[PDB]
Amino acid sequence: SQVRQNYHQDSEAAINRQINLELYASYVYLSMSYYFDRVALKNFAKYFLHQSHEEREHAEKLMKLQNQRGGRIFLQDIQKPDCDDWESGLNAMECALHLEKNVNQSLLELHKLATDKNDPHLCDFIETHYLNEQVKAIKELGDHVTNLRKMGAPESGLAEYLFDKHTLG
Amino acid sequence: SQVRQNYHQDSEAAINRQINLELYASYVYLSMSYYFDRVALKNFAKYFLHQSHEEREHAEKLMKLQNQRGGRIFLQDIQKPDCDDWESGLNAMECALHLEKNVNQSLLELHKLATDKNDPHLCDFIETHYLNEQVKAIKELGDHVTNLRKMGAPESGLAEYLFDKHTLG
Amino acid sequence: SQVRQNYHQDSEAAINRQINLELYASYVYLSMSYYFDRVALKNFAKYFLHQSHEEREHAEKLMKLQNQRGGRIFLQDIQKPDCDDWESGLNAMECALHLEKNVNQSLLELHKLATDKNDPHLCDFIETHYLNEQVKAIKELGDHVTNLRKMGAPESGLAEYLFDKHTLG
Amino acid sequence: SQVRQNYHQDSEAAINRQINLELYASYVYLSMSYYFDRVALKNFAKYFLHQSHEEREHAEKLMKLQNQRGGRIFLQDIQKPDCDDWESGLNAMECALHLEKNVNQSLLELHKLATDKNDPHLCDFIETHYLNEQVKAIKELGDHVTNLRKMGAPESGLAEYLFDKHTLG
Amino acid sequence: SQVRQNYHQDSEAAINRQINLELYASYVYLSMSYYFDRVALKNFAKYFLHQSHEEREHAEKLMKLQNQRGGRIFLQDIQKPDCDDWESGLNAMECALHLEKNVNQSLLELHKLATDKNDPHLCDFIETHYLNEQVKAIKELGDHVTNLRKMGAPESGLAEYLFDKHTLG
Amino acid sequence: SQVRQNYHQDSEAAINRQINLELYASYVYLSMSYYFDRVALKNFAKYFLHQSHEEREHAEKLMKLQNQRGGRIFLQDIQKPDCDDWESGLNAMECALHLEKNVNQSLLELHKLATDKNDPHLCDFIETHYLNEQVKAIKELGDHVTNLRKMGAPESGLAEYLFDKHTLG
Ligand SMILES: [Ca+2]
Ligand SMILES: [Ca+2]
Ligand SMILES: [Ca+2]
Ligand SMILES: [Ca+2]
Ligand SMILES: [Ca+2]
Ligand SMILES: [Ca+2]
Ligand SMILES: [Cl-]
Ligand SMILES: [Cl-]
Ligand SMILES: [Cl-]
Ligand SMILES: [Cl-]
Ligand SMILES: [Cl-]
Ligand SMILES: [Cl-]
Ligand SMILES: [Cl-]
Ligand SMILES: [Cl-]
Ligand SMILES: [Cl-]
Ligand SMILES: [Cl-]
Ligand SMILES: [Cl-]
Ligand SMILES: [Cl-]
Ligand SMILES: [Fe+3]
Ligand SMILES: [Fe+3]
Ligand SMILES: [Fe+3]
Ligand SMILES: [Fe+3]
Ligand SMILES: [Fe+3]
Ligand SMILES: [Fe+3]
Ligand SMILES: [Fe+3]
Ligand SMILES: [Fe+3]
Ligand SMILES: [Fe+3]
Ligand SMILES: [Fe+3]
Ligand SMILES: [Fe+3]
Ligand SMILES: [Fe+3]
Ligand SMILES: [Mg+2]
Ligand SMILES: [Mg+2]
Ligand SMILES: [Mg+2]
Ligand SMILES: [Mg+2]
Ligand SMILES: [Mg+2]
Ligand SMILES: [Mg+2]
Ligand SMILES: [Mg+2]
Ligand SMILES: [Mg+2]
Ligand SMILES: [Mg+2]
Ligand SMILES: [Mg+2]
Ligand SMILES: [Mg+2]
Ligand SMILES: [Mg+2]
Ligand SMILES: [Mg+2]
Ligand SMILES: [Mg+2]
Ligand SMILES: [Mg+2]
Ligand SMILES: [Mg+2]
Ligand SMILES: [Mg+2]
Ligand SMILES: [Mg+2]
Ligand SMILES: [Mg+2]
Ligand SMILES: [Mg+2]
Ligand SMILES: [Mg+2]
Ligand SMILES: [Mg+2]
Ligand SMILES: [Mg+2]
Ligand SMILES: [Mg+2]
Ligand SMILES: [Mg+2]
Ligand SMILES: [Mg+2]
């Protein structure tokens, strides 16, 4: 590649792995969205559909980065989510929180690699477009979990209904 | 399901298979798009990115249909595309044409099943939202293949450059 | 905390210390502002009041960060400023310069800690919202000191009057 | 001071004490605000942040008064609030009510002093800018306490959630 | 300097060297622009003139940085470009690509120095204003080279003419 | 050159020398500008930055002329200015006046050459775009020197401060 410069093969591979993980997160959220479409919590459905589109954008930005740095995108299967039945609004929020913490850990390992390979452009890319977005998403999901639990979810179906209307609406 | 009516278990399964195929088509087009981003044919890249978003919409409409009819969505892995290197604008257009004819065949088998199970709502759904969209997409890809070949692609890099500017721009 | 991830207890403590320092800086500037209100240099008063509001915003952003990362805010007394009588516009500018260099040193020690604990989100937070703001503030105060000295302050009361009108007005 | 007239040294001192108390109230409300930011009651957080800014304005108006009357501002440490963990929306409202009644008592003692020193300008200043503001704030906090208790707080987390949405939102 | 803080003499010197390099890049692009003005490829001329103005802005931002950090600007001769006759649009694009990779390498060495001297403000400055701009410029020039070669340049004068109209126009 | 007509080789060379001198003047003014940025005379800095951009335009117009007449641009190193520390606003204005008189002398020698070679287009070009611009710039710099001296510069730092505000602001 005539453009490649200071771009380690290990970073290229790690970026391909992160592309797959962002697409996976998009698929999990898509599944969650249509679960809540089925069980008639329309604002849970809207919230997770928006999250799913955001993760596709996350994946696309990494694909652009791979090309910008003179690497080559290598795609892999997007694994299906762990569940098709997400049980409750609270359970889906807890699963999303767990997912985003896992994605954050992968981004931190990616940043450690970029640091170890002295790749400041890649470090800046991760910090600028991913790390604070993860922190905000984790706190937001934590906040939703906190409120749903305090309201009496998941036993209180009234709680999940009112949360759908007042927080996600 | 208290809403399910005249919705055969075989149709439910076939709709889940079609959801996966539409997501697969979306992934193929996403791959094609970023291949052309890499090799600097920006309007090929834009064309296939738009196609990829359209297929995600196709998948989402089938997921909504599954829920509307009282079925249950069962997702599967989204397989990676056959190639990561799509070779040329002409080759990608030929591969997309082949893909859309395969998707059309699956939709026609779906319609045959809905006909065999006397499900006129499902027949109408397929006809209204999928069958003419497929015919239009197949003719459009065929037209692109026809013009690229007539211009001298794929040997003529000038041909693919000018097609990118004048047809896809 | 269900949101806390890669957030060292030492960083949490250092962020609480920085919150206190930003509030302290806000209080110093508030004192300076009303000193110049008393001695009738209204644009010195306006300048330092604006600086005081900016430091409160600095403190609030760190409090938000503490919460975002799953830490806990621990507030301490806000110490009164070193003076109630700031003597002259030049002396107040020199004191503000000294204060901002002290705050900068504390932020650099904070960044060293975040670096030592491999916390790239915290490093980015400090760089993005604090480090260049400090450099700009230090140069601006240095510039004000430079001009006031060149004009003949603090002996020339005319100098401070004209600086109030022409630079701070 | 060439402007000082009918301004007793005891009133000057009492005004300096009141400045400190208003800044203290601002700090208490700032603490309460970010507690509710942490535990995800965003409209409690907004309500107390607004209250904190109002108290800073209260302090600034007294600092302006001190200067207007030819006195000298003497600042003291701003003590940290009694708690960092405010327990519940109800508890924070009860603590704020107690604080505002304490501030009101200090303002009434200030007015008694201004009356005893035959300072009608100071009496009018306190009446015009502070006394009715205190009465309104006390009744408002009392009303919030009344409603939260009637709704079942603090045991009912649903109560505090719905109060956050419907009264503070 | 009363403003200088955590700013190593080696970094100051390296910033002066980078100022000279950015001015040099501006001069190379100015030369390329008027070469294409002479041989009547007006959009090549416009493209490189814009690039030349961008590099002057790059140099000016580093001069501002030098002053902001309490250093002193030391200018050196701006060397003339390697060629006055740039041969072809393709050759100029290849020369610009080589230049931008050389400038990128100098910026990465600058970042390594700022890292070695624990200067996070300087690291952030380089990352924020220079490193991604370099990556984008390198990929863009690589893309132009890729397309011109695929079109048949430099032998095909038609290729360079059409590229001037369709990509740079 | 198929366009060259009545364009002597000596004039072509003299135009290349004038291009270099205009770029040199641009560099001197750029240096002066950032000197005043450093020592906090912001309107001196703005004035000289504008002058520096004007000289780059002067150089570009001569480069266009060289091409228009069928000559060839030959660039040379742009020498660094005589000083990096310009001492005072008055000294910089005196140095700029000296520079512009030197540039004027070179333009008058250029016009003498164009006259000697019976090149009326070149004579008109110099008269139309350069000679009156030089006379205006020389008188303007002379006026600035006159006022700064009358105000008490360079000993009076107040003088330079007020001139920065009232004449250059
Ligand atoms: Ca950065
Ligand atoms: Ca129909
Ligand atoms: Ca960063
Ligand atoms: Ca009254
Ligand atoms: Ca940064
Ligand atoms: Ca004429
Ligand atoms: Cl590399
Ligand atoms: Cl981010
Ligand atoms: Cl059925
Ligand atoms: Cl259709
Ligand atoms: Cl942790
Ligand atoms: Cl900053
Ligand atoms: Cl009195
Ligand atoms: Cl009132
Ligand atoms: Cl230093
Ligand atoms: Cl950048
Ligand atoms: Cl001739
Ligand atoms: Cl003129
Ligand atoms: Fe998200
Ligand atoms: Fe993501
Ligand atoms: Fe399509
Ligand atoms: Fe489709
Ligand atoms: Fe500030
Ligand atoms: Fe601050
Ligand atoms: Fe209030
Ligand atoms: Fe108050
Ligand atoms: Fe550029
Ligand atoms: Fe540059
Ligand atoms: Fe000029
Ligand atoms: Fe000139
Ligand atoms: Mg490879
Ligand atoms: Mg599996
Ligand atoms: Mg290395
Ligand atoms: Mg950011
Ligand atoms: Mg079933
Ligand atoms: Mg496989
Ligand atoms: Mg039947
Ligand atoms: Mg139709
Ligand atoms: Mg703790
Ligand atoms: Mg003390
Ligand atoms: Mg660690
Ligand atoms: Mg920044
Ligand atoms: Mg006294
Ligand atoms: Mg204490
Ligand atoms: Mg009396
Ligand atoms: Mg009233
Ligand atoms: Mg030095
Ligand atoms: Mg040389
Ligand atoms: Mg050090
Ligand atoms: Mg860093
Ligand atoms: Mg950036
Ligand atoms: Mg010649
Ligand atoms: Mg020399
Ligand atoms: Mg002749
Ligand atoms: Mg004449
Ligand atoms: Mg004229």
Coordinates of C-alpha atoms in Angstrom, one line a residue, chain C residues 55-136:
Chain C
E55 CA -14.1 27.9 36.7
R56 CA -17.4 26.8 38.1
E57 CA -18.2 25.2 34.8
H58 CA -14.8 23.5 35.0
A59 CA -15.7 22.1 38.4
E60 CA -19.1 21.0 37.2
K61 CA -17.6 19.1 34.2
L62 CA -15.3 17.2 36.6
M63 CA -18.3 16.4 38.9
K64 CA -20.1 15.0 35.8
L65 CA -17.0 13.0 34.9
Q66 CA -16.8 11.5 38.4
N67 CA -20.4 10.3 38.1
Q68 CA -20.0 9.2 34.4
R69 CA -17.0 6.9 35.4
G70 CA -18.8 5.3 38.4
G71 CA -16.9 7.2 41.0
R72 CA -18.3 9.2 43.9
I73 CA -18.0 12.9 44.5
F74 CA -16.5 13.9 47.8
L75 CA -16.5 17.7 48.3
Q76 CA -14.3 19.6 50.7
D77 CA -14.3 23.1 52.1
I78 CA -13.6 25.8 49.5
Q79 CA -10.8 27.8 51.0
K80 CA -11.0 31.6 51.0
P81 CA -8.6 33.4 48.6
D82 CA -5.2 34.5 49.9
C83 CA -6.3 38.2 49.8
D84 CA -9.4 40.3 50.1
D85 CA -7.6 43.4 48.8
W86 CA -6.0 42.7 45.5
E87 CA -4.0 46.0 45.4
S88 CA -4.1 46.8 41.7
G89 CA -5.2 45.5 38.3
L90 CA -1.6 44.4 37.6
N91 CA -1.3 42.6 40.9
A92 CA -4.6 40.8 40.3
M93 CA -3.5 39.7 36.9
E94 CA -0.2 38.5 38.2
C95 CA -2.0 36.6 41.0
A96 CA -4.4 35.0 38.4
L97 CA -1.4 34.0 36.3
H98 CA 0.2 32.3 39.3
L99 CA -3.1 30.6 40.1
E100 CA -3.6 29.3 36.6
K101 CA 0.0 27.9 36.4
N102 CA -0.7 26.1 39.7
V103 CA -3.9 24.7 38.4
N104 CA -2.1 23.6 35.2
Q105 CA 0.5 21.8 37.2
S106 CA -2.2 19.9 39.1
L107 CA -3.8 19.0 35.8
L108 CA -0.5 17.7 34.4
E109 CA 0.0 15.6 37.6
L110 CA -3.6 14.3 37.0
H111 CA -2.7 13.4 33.4
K112 CA 0.5 11.7 34.6
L113 CA -1.6 9.6 37.0
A114 CA -4.2 8.7 34.3
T115 CA -1.3 7.7 32.0
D116 CA 0.3 5.6 34.8
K117 CA -3.0 3.9 35.4
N118 CA -3.6 3.3 31.6
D119 CA -6.8 5.3 31.6
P120 CA -7.0 6.7 28.0
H121 CA -10.6 8.0 28.5
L122 CA -9.4 10.2 31.4
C123 CA -6.3 11.3 29.5
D124 CA -8.5 12.4 26.6
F125 CA -10.9 14.1 29.0
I126 CA -8.1 16.2 30.5
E127 CA -6.5 17.0 27.1
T128 CA -9.9 17.9 25.5
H129 CA -11.5 20.0 28.1
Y130 CA -8.7 21.3 30.3
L131 CA -5.1 21.4 29.0
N132 CA -5.5 23.8 26.1
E133 CA -7.9 25.9 28.0
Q134 CA -5.1 26.3 30.6
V135 CA -2.5 27.2 28.0
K136 CA -4.8 29.8 26.5

